[PDB]
Swiss-Prot record:
Function: Cysteine protease that cleaves viral polyprotein and specific host proteins. It is responsible for the autocatalytic cleavage between the P1 and P2 regions, which is the first cleavage occurring in the polyprotein. Also cleaves the host translation initiation factor EIF4G1, in order to shut down the capped cellular mRNA translation. Inhibits the host nucleus-cytoplasm protein and RNA trafficking by cleaving host members of the nuclear pores. Counteracts stress granule formation probably by antagonizing its assembly or promoting its dissassembly.
Assembly behavior: Homodimer.
Reaction it catalyzes: Selective cleavage of Tyr-|-Gly bond in the picornavirus polyprotein
Residues included from the entire protein: 869 to 1007 of 2193
Highest taxon of the lineage: Viruses
Active-site residue list: 15 (for protease 2a activity), 33 (for protease 2a activity), 104 (for protease 2a activity)
SS bonds (residue pairs): none
Residues holding Zn(2+) 1: 50, 52, 110, 112
Name of this chain's protein: Protease 2A
Length: 139
């Protein structure tokens, strides 16, 4: 579990969105596993607007932060699950690192701010759903 709170927006994994998220829906994309809902309180997170390929992510299954090198956002095949059929997920970045089911929602950050959230993982890999191209999160 985990979310990005920026301005009047809350960014979460689409497969983990609540009834409230859907009732206050701004935008959602199954192909990216992202959902953005509206909030009344103001959000304190800063979003990075960069092309960094290094950063630090929070891993709840280890209660620790880990430094990672990660790939550029791309279309990567993701196995079937209770949430989705087998498909290509877009804007996804992979890194060599630990992750387990339950780690989705962990934030990835570089020196510029929030880069994305854990969305996939397994086999010593961890996948992050990028949010740097969503320029409208700030305005
Ligand atoms: N379609 C997706 O983005 C997700 C939906 C939930 C399920 N997905 C995963 O990748 C699961 C499958 C099992 O192994 C792991 C290990 C670590 C992590 Cl962070 C996630 C998973 C795909
Ligand atoms: Zn950066």
């Amino acid at each position: 579990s985990g979310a990005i709170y920026v301005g009047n927006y809350r960014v979460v994994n689409r497969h983990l969105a609540t009834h409230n998220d859907w009732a206050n829906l701004v935008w959602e994309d199954s192909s990216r596993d992202l959902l953005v809902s509206s909030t009344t309180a103001q959000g304190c997170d800063t979003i990075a607007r960069c092309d960094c390929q290094t950063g630090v992510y929070y891993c709840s299954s280890r209660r620790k932060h880990y430094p990672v090198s990660f790939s550029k956002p791309s279309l990567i095949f993701v196995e079937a699950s209770e949430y989705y059929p087998a498909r290509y997920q877009s804007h996804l970045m992979l890194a060599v690192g630990h992750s387990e089911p339950g780690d989705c929602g962990g934030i990835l950050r570089c020196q510029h701010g929030v880069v994305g959230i854990v969305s996939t993982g397994g086999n010593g890999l961890v996948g992050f759903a990028d949010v740097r191209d969503l320029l409208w999160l700030d305005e």
